[PDB]
Amino acid sequence: MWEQFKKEKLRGYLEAKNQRKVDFDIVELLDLINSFDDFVTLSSCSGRIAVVDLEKPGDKASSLFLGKWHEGVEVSEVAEAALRSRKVAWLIQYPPIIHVACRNIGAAKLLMNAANTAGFRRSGVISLSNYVVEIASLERIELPVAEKGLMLVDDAYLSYVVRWANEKLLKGKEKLGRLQEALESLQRENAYCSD
Amino acid sequence: MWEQFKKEKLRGYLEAKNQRKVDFDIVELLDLINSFDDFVTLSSCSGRIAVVDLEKPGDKASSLFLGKWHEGVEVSEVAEAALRSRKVAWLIQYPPIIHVACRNIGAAKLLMNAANTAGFRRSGVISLSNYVVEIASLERIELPVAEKGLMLVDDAYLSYVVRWANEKLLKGKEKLGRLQEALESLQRENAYCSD
């Protein structure tokens, strides 16, 4: 059952790589994870900062992305997006989130422990069925900044909340890098020895 | 091992109830949870809105609570707190979070499924050891509103973000109520029948 399950999920990942529908900056991590026998990736996001045009907060049905960045962003990029709002522009920082199915309870514990080592608090098994571990962090810089193309906050305040968003996104990338290291250190234990 | 583990943890909960160190509005839920043989509560928060005086964002070491509410808050209460800041006052909404140890994998799956039924996305096993299930939600209204007793945002904007915070806190309480119902519906199956 596990090998057939992993083949199905891995086919989904390879199709997303072919369609260029995987965050370029964690293709390595995800490849690495899938190179363990007892893991298969399900989904991932390496973290982002966005500006989203929203009628009401949490109204995902009204939502339109005004701008989206997988890396640190200039205050200027953010204002630019916000000035294009037709409803309320929200600045949103999404931290990294990875889902990995694990073959058994020991494999889940291994991955959870590495995630924790890397600094991902709030990592957990979100489905016991195929021990799907979520590796994640607390998910809310989320604040309104413009309405119908007009700013709600002054340039100083915008600058402050963007710098903060940048700094959080970077810390997410740091933790992703550490997790890749940890898994690489693990995986490469006998890279230079047959025995 | 489980009964000795549960006795230790339950003693911690009863001591916190005696010291009035448990959120009054989920004493019922937590009691109910502890009335299952296969569960024991570890910790909980029923959700809150706070204003916190912070040097930098996430600088928990500089943090001082200027105001804290377990229920919906008047915009006026929030401004009042913020005006007392000596550093940067942040408005923070914390959603409900419950930790429950479960006796076996079936018990974990049961609790996770009820939590999901109630609307707690992002519920998971955060330690496989004693199947500690975290019941929780996404945790960030978090924004700066005053500095050294002076407002950074206008009254309209403050009103808007407080209303939003109120609405999120209420939805957390709704989900807590639903989870208590679900567990009660479960627990009371043979309340009126010996057989």
From Swiss-Prot, chains A, B:
Keywords for this protein: Methyltransferase, S-adenosyl-L-methionine, Transferase, tRNA processing
InterPro entries membership: Taw3, tRNA_yW-synthesising, tRNA_yW-synthesising-like_sf
Biological process according to GO: tRNA methylation; wybutosine biosynthetic process
Pfam families on file: TYW3
Cysteine disulfide links: none
Listed EC numbers: 2.1.1.282
Catalysed transformations (reactions): 4-demethyl-7-[(3S)-3-amino-3-carboxypropyl]wyosine(37) in tRNA(Phe) + S-adenosyl-L-methionine = 7-[(3S)-3-amino-3-carboxypropyl]wyosine(37) in tRNA(Phe) + S-adenosyl-L-homocysteine + H(+)
Ligase is among the record's keywords: no
UniProt-listed Gene3D superfamilies: tRNA wybutosine-synthesizing-like
Enzyme class: transferase
GO molecular function: tRNA methyltransferase activity
Ribosomal protein keyword on record: no
Family note: Belongs to the TYW3 family.
Purpose of the protein: S-adenosyl-L-methionine-dependent methyltransferase that acts as a component of the wyosine derivatives biosynthesis pathway.
Protein name in the entry: tRNA(Phe) 7-((3-amino-3-carboxypropyl)-4-demethylwyosine(37)-N(4))-methyltransferase
